[PDB]
CSV table of C-alpha atoms in Angstrom, one decimal:
chain,number,residue,atom,x,y,z
A,1,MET,CA,-21.3,28.6,20.8
A,2,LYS,CA,-19.0,27.5,17.9
A,3,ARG,CA,-20.6,24.6,15.3
A,4,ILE,CA,-19.1,21.4,15.6
A,5,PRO,CA,-18.0,19.9,12.5
A,6,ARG,CA,-19.6,16.3,11.7
A,7,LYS,CA,-17.9,12.7,10.8
A,8,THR,CA,-19.9,11.4,8.3
A,9,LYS,CA,-21.6,12.2,5.3
A,10,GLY,CA,-25.3,12.3,5.9
A,11,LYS,CA,-28.8,13.5,4.3
A,12,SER,CA,-27.7,16.6,2.4
A,13,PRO,CA,4.9,39.5,46.9
A,14,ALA,CA,6.8,35.8,46.3
A,15,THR,CA,5.1,33.3,44.2
A,16,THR,CA,7.7,30.6,44.6
A,17,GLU,CA,6.3,27.9,46.9
A,18,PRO,CA,8.8,25.7,48.2
A,19,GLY,CA,7.5,22.4,47.3
A,20,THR,CA,7.2,22.9,43.3
A,21,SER,CA,10.9,22.3,42.2
A,22,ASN,CA,11.2,19.1,40.2
A,23,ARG,CA,14.4,16.7,40.8
A,24,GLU,CA,12.5,13.4,41.1
A,25,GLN,CA,14.8,11.0,38.9
A,26,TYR,CA,12.5,7.7,38.5
A,27,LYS,CA,12.3,5.4,35.8
A,28,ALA,CA,9.0,3.5,36.0
A,29,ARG,CA,9.2,-0.6,35.8
A,30,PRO,CA,7.6,-1.8,33.6
A,31,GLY,CA,8.1,1.5,31.2
A,32,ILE,CA,4.5,3.9,30.5
A,33,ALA,CA,5.5,3.8,26.7
A,34,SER,CA,5.6,0.0,26.3
A,35,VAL,CA,2.5,-0.2,28.2
A,36,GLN,CA,0.6,2.6,26.1
A,37,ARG,CA,1.6,0.8,22.7
A,38,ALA,CA,0.3,-2.2,23.8
A,39,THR,CA,-3.4,-0.9,24.9
A,40,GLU,CA,-3.8,0.9,21.9
A,41,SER,CA,-4.0,-2.6,20.1
A,42,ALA,CA,-6.7,-3.5,22.7
A,43,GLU,CA,-8.6,-0.9,22.3
A,44,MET,CA,-9.6,-1.1,18.2
A,45,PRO,CA,-12.7,-2.1,18.1
A,46,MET,CA,-14.0,-5.3,16.2
A,47,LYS,CA,-14.8,-5.4,12.4
A,48,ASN,CA,-17.7,-5.1,10.8
A,49,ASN,CA,-19.1,-8.2,9.2
A,50,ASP,CA,-22.1,-6.9,6.9
A,51,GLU,CA,-21.3,-9.5,4.1
A,52,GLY,CA,-25.0,-11.0,3.4
A,53,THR,CA,-26.4,-7.7,4.5
A,54,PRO,CA,-28.9,-6.0,1.8
A,55,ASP,CA,-28.0,-2.2,0.6
A,56,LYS,CA,-29.9,0.4,0.1
A,57,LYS,CA,-31.7,-0.8,-2.9
A,58,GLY,CA,-31.8,-4.1,-1.7
A,59,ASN,CA,-29.6,-6.5,-3.1
A,60,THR,CA,-27.2,-8.4,-0.8
A,61,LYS,CA,-24.0,-7.3,-0.3
A,62,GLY,CA,-20.9,-9.9,-0.5
A,63,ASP,CA,-19.4,-12.0,-3.1
A,64,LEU,CA,-20.4,-15.3,-4.8
A,65,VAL,CA,-18.8,-18.1,-2.7
A,66,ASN,CA,-20.2,-21.5,-1.5
A,67,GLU,CA,-21.7,-21.0,2.4
A,68,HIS,CA,-18.9,-23.6,3.3
A,69,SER,CA,-16.2,-22.7,1.1
A,70,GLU,CA,-16.3,-19.4,2.1
A,71,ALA,CA,-15.5,-20.2,6.0
A,72,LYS,CA,-12.5,-22.2,5.3
A,73,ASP,CA,-11.1,-19.6,3.2
A,74,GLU,CA,-11.8,-17.1,6.0
A,75,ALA,CA,-9.5,-19.3,8.2
A,76,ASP,CA,-6.8,-19.2,5.9
A,77,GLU,CA,-6.4,-15.3,6.1
A,78,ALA,CA,-6.2,-15.7,10.0
A,79,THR,CA,-3.6,-18.1,9.8
A,80,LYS,CA,-1.4,-15.6,7.3
A,81,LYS,CA,-2.7,-13.0,9.3
A,82,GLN,CA,-1.5,-14.3,12.4
A,83,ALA,CA,2.4,-15.0,11.1
A,84,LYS,CA,2.5,-11.5,10.3
A,85,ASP,CA,2.0,-10.2,13.6
A,86,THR,CA,4.2,-12.6,15.5
A,87,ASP,CA,7.1,-12.1,12.7
A,88,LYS,CA,7.5,-15.9,11.6
A,89,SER,CA,7.0,-17.3,7.8
A,90,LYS,CA,4.6,-19.9,10.0
A,91,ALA,CA,2.7,-19.3,12.5
A,92,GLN,CA,2.1,-21.8,16.2
A,93,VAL,CA,-1.6,-20.6,16.5
A,94,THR,CA,-3.4,-22.1,13.8
A,95,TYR,CA,-7.0,-20.8,12.6
A,96,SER,CA,-6.9,-23.9,9.9
A,97,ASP,CA,-6.1,-27.5,9.4
A,98,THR,CA,-6.8,-28.3,12.8
A,99,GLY,CA,-7.6,-32.1,14.1
A,100,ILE,CA,-11.0,-30.9,14.8
A,101,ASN,CA,-13.8,-31.8,11.7
A,102,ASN,CA,-15.8,-29.2,11.3
A,103,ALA,CA,-17.9,-29.7,8.0
A,104,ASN,CA,-21.1,-28.5,8.7
A,105,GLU,CA,-19.9,-24.8,9.5
A,106,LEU,CA,-21.4,-22.1,7.6
A,107,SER,CA,-20.4,-18.4,7.2
A,108,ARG,CA,-22.3,-15.7,5.7
A,109,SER,CA,-22.0,-14.6,2.1
A,110,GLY,CA,-23.9,-13.0,-0.9
A,111,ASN,CA,-24.8,-16.0,-2.5
A,112,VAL,CA,-28.0,-16.3,-0.2
A,113,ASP,CA,-31.1,-13.9,0.1
A,114,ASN,CA,-33.2,-13.3,2.5
A,115,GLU,CA,-35.9,-15.3,1.4
A,116,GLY,CA,-33.5,-18.2,1.3
A,117,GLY,CA,-33.2,-18.3,-2.5
A,118,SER,CA,-30.3,-17.9,-4.8
A,119,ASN,CA,-28.5,-14.6,-5.8
A,120,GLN,CA,-27.5,-15.9,-9.5
A,121,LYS,CA,-29.4,-12.8,-10.9
A,122,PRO,CA,-29.7,-9.7,-8.3
A,123,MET,CA,-33.4,-8.7,-6.8
A,124,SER,CA,-33.1,-5.8,-8.2
A,125,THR,CA,-33.3,-7.4,-11.6
A,126,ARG,CA,-36.0,-9.8,-10.3
A,127,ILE,CA,-38.3,-7.0,-9.6
A,128,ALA,CA,-37.8,-5.5,-12.9
A,129,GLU,CA,-38.7,-8.4,-15.0
A,130,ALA,CA,-41.7,-9.5,-13.2
A,131,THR,CA,-43.5,-6.1,-13.4
A,132,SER,CA,-42.2,-5.8,-17.1
A,133,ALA,CA,-44.6,-8.4,-18.5
A,134,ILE,CA,-47.6,-6.4,-16.9
A,135,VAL,CA,-47.7,-3.6,-19.1
A,136,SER,CA,-49.4,-2.2,-22.2
A,137,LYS,CA,-49.1,0.2,-24.3
A,138,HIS,CA,-51.6,2.9,-26.9
A,139,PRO,CA,-53.7,1.1,-29.6
A,140,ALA,CA,-52.8,2.2,-32.9
B,1,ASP,CA,-64.2,-9.1,-12.3
B,2,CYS,CA,-65.2,-6.5,-14.7
B,3,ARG,CA,-65.0,-7.6,-18.7
B,4,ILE,CA,-66.6,-5.0,-21.0
B,5,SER,CA,-68.4,-6.0,-24.2
B,6,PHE,CA,-69.4,-4.0,-27.0
B,7,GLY,CA,-72.7,-3.2,-27.8
B,8,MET,CA,-73.8,-4.0,-31.8
B,9,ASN,CA,-75.8,-2.2,-34.1
B,10,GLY,CA,-76.5,0.9,-31.8
B,11,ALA,CA,-76.5,-1.4,-28.5
B,12,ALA,CA,-74.9,0.4,-25.8
B,13,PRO,CA,-71.5,-1.2,-24.3
B,14,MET,CA,-72.1,-3.2,-20.8
B,15,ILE,CA,-69.7,-3.5,-17.8
B,16,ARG,CA,-70.2,-6.9,-15.3
B,17,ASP,CA,-71.3,-5.7,-12.0
B,18,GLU,CA,-70.1,-7.8,-8.7
B,19,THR,CA,-73.6,-9.2,-8.6
B,20,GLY,CA,-72.6,-10.3,-12.3
B,21,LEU,CA,-75.2,-8.0,-13.7
B,22,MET,CA,-74.4,-6.4,-17.0
B,23,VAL,CA,-74.9,-1.9,-16.8
B,24,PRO,CA,-74.8,0.5,-19.4
B,25,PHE,CA,-71.9,3.4,-19.2
B,26,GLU,CA,-73.7,5.6,-17.0
B,27,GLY,CA,-75.0,6.5,-12.8
B,28,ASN,CA,-72.8,6.2,-10.3
B,29,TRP,CA,-69.9,3.9,-9.7
B,30,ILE,CA,-67.7,2.7,-7.1
B,31,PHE,CA,-64.2,1.4,-7.8
B,32,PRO,CA,-61.3,0.3,-5.9
B,33,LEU,CA,-58.2,1.6,-7.1
B,34,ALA,CA,-56.9,-1.5,-7.9
B,35,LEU,CA,-59.0,-1.8,-11.1
B,36,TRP,CA,-57.9,0.9,-12.8
B,37,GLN,CA,-54.2,0.5,-12.1
B,38,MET,CA,-55.0,-3.0,-14.0
B,39,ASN,CA,-56.6,-2.1,-16.7
B,40,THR,CA,-55.0,1.8,-17.1
B,41,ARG,CA,-54.9,1.5,-20.5
B,42,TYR,CA,-58.2,-0.4,-21.8
B,43,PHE,CA,-60.1,1.5,-19.7
B,44,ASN,CA,-58.7,4.9,-20.5
B,45,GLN,CA,-59.8,4.1,-23.9
B,46,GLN,CA,-63.5,3.4,-23.3
B,47,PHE,CA,-64.8,5.2,-20.5
B,48,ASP,CA,-63.1,9.0,-21.1
B,49,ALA,CA,-65.8,10.2,-23.6
C,1,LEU,CA,-36.1,-18.1,-14.2
C,2,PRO,CA,-32.0,-18.4,-15.1
C,3,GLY,CA,-31.1,-17.6,-18.5
C,4,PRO,CA,-31.5,-14.7,-21.4
C,5,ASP,CA,-34.6,-13.1,-21.9
C,6,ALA,CA,-36.8,-14.4,-18.7
C,7,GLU,CA,-39.4,-11.5,-19.6
C,8,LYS,CA,-42.1,-14.2,-21.8
C,9,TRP,CA,-41.7,-16.7,-18.6
C,10,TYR,CA,-43.7,-15.1,-16.0
C,11,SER,CA,-46.7,-14.7,-18.7
C,12,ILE,CA,-46.5,-18.8,-19.2
C,13,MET,CA,-45.9,-19.5,-16.0
C,14,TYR,CA,-48.8,-18.2,-14.0
C,15,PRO,CA,-52.1,-17.6,-16.7
C,16,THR,CA,-54.0,-16.2,-13.7
C,17,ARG,CA,-52.1,-13.3,-13.2
C,18,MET,CA,-53.5,-11.5,-16.3
C,19,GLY,CA,-55.8,-9.0,-16.1
C,20,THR,CA,-59.5,-9.4,-17.4
C,21,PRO,CA,-61.2,-6.2,-19.1
C,22,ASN,CA,-62.2,-8.4,-22.1
C,23,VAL,CA,-65.1,-10.9,-22.5
C,24,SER,CA,-63.2,-13.3,-25.0
C,25,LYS,CA,-62.7,-17.1,-24.4
C,26,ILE,CA,-59.3,-16.7,-22.7
C,27,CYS,CA,-60.4,-14.0,-20.5
C,28,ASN,CA,-63.4,-15.6,-19.6
C,29,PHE,CA,-61.4,-18.8,-18.1
C,30,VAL,CA,-59.5,-16.5,-16.2
C,31,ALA,CA,-62.3,-15.1,-14.5
C,32,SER,CA,-63.4,-18.1,-13.1
C,33,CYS,CA,-60.6,-19.4,-10.9
C,34,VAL,CA,-59.4,-18.9,-7.7
C,35,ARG,CA,-57.1,-16.1,-7.0
C,36,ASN,CA,-54.9,-17.6,-3.9
C,37,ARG,CA,-53.2,-20.5,-5.9
C,38,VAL,CA,-50.6,-18.7,-7.5
C,39,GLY,CA,-46.4,-19.3,-6.5
C,40,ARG,CA,-44.8,-20.1,-3.8
C,41,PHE,CA,-47.1,-21.4,-0.8
C,42,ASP,CA,-44.8,-24.0,1.7
C,43,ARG,CA,-41.2,-23.6,2.7
C,44,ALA,CA,-38.5,-25.4,5.2
C,45,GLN,CA,-36.4,-23.1,6.3
C,46,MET,CA,-33.9,-24.8,8.8
C,47,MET,CA,-30.8,-22.1,8.8
C,48,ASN,CA,-30.9,-18.5,9.3
C,49,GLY,CA,-29.2,-17.2,6.5
D,1,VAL,CA,0.7,-9.3,24.1
D,2,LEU,CA,-0.7,-6.8,26.6
D,3,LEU,CA,-0.3,-9.6,29.5
D,4,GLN,CA,3.3,-10.0,28.4
D,5,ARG,CA,4.0,-6.2,28.8
D,6,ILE,CA,2.2,-6.2,32.3
D,7,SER,CA,3.4,-9.8,34.0
D,8,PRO,CA,6.3,-9.7,35.7
D,9,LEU,CA,6.6,-13.5,34.8
D,10,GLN,CA,9.8,-14.0,32.3
D,11,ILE,CA,10.3,-17.5,30.3
D,12,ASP,CA,14.1,-18.1,30.4
D,13,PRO,CA,15.0,-21.4,28.7
D,14,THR,CA,18.6,-21.8,29.8
D,15,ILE,CA,17.2,-22.8,33.1
D,16,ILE,CA,16.2,-26.0,31.4
D,17,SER,CA,20.2,-26.8,29.8
D,18,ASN,CA,21.6,-25.6,32.8
D,19,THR,CA,19.8,-28.5,35.2
D,20,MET,CA,20.1,-31.4,32.0
D,21,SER,CA,23.8,-30.2,32.3
D,22,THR,CA,24.4,-32.5,29.3
D,23,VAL,CA,27.2,-31.6,26.9
D,24,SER,CA,28.3,-34.9,25.3
D,25,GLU,CA,29.3,-33.2,21.9
D,26,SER,CA,29.1,-35.6,19.3
D,27,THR,CA,27.4,-38.5,21.0
D,28,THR,CA,28.0,-41.5,19.0
D,29,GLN,CA,23.9,-42.6,19.6
D,30,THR,CA,20.9,-39.9,20.7
D,31,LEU,CA,19.5,-42.8,22.8
D,32,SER,CA,21.1,-40.8,25.8
D,33,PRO,CA,17.4,-39.2,26.8
D,34,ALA,CA,19.6,-36.4,28.1
D,35,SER,CA,20.0,-35.4,24.4
D,36,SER,CA,16.4,-36.6,23.3
D,37,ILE,CA,14.5,-34.6,25.6
D,38,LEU,CA,16.9,-31.1,24.9
D,39,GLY,CA,16.3,-31.9,20.9
D,40,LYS,CA,12.7,-32.2,21.3
D,41,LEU,CA,12.2,-28.7,23.2
D,42,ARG,CA,14.4,-26.9,21.3
D,43,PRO,CA,15.1,-24.4,24.1
D,44,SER,CA,16.9,-21.9,21.4
D,45,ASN,CA,13.1,-20.7,20.0
D,46,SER,CA,12.0,-17.6,22.1
D,47,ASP,CA,8.4,-18.1,20.7
D,48,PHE,CA,5.9,-18.4,23.5
D,49,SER,CA,3.0,-17.2,21.9
């Protein structure tokens, strides 16, 4: 048996039977190529929304944006993308500026840590400072 | 609470027991590890000899 | 605390966090204190994240 | 998009225009109800997302 390479980085007599010939001429409707292209887009797995989760050292990933303001920005990106797929300057289907009045909507960001505090200073930096004012030195 | 008091005029130094007594630097002692971690620099100077 | 040189504030905020190896006046005061009333002790978390 | 490519339905806006059968080129006013509804619908547009 041969090794299988990894995908991600890790820790380290006549023989011509009568009914064989091909003279059929059939063009399917709908066509195979058209359907195959469409179904590839549906196969695509959903995007990983890892913003707001901690990292290897414990700091929270993501940018420092307000919780509510983050939601509105993401909606505007969706509408811009929606126009691009439809090949139009303006999109009929919009995720922003609807008649609905979502103002309490929240979305994850890097502003808030797991304790409910602010991330103005990285969590690792906080630990280093707190343990620093404990140290002692050899006498002269 | 393990406060250490220096001795005067030849008197031996003493440390505070859990019951509140002062004992000299001898005998058999029982220490939680957290004590040495808190006073690593101070305890080394006083106890090593 | 936000700002520069926040290292110094940790000593002023929490007097009871200091170790007590000495029989100084300051160390005597810290020794006679309760050890559970420090830092945060209550919160109101309504939203996850 | 997947529903579009597998559905036997075709959207043909010219059915509306043929049914109305109103030309009235450069009508002296748009008060003719046939012209008004045709303007609102805009059958020329082909986006049905």
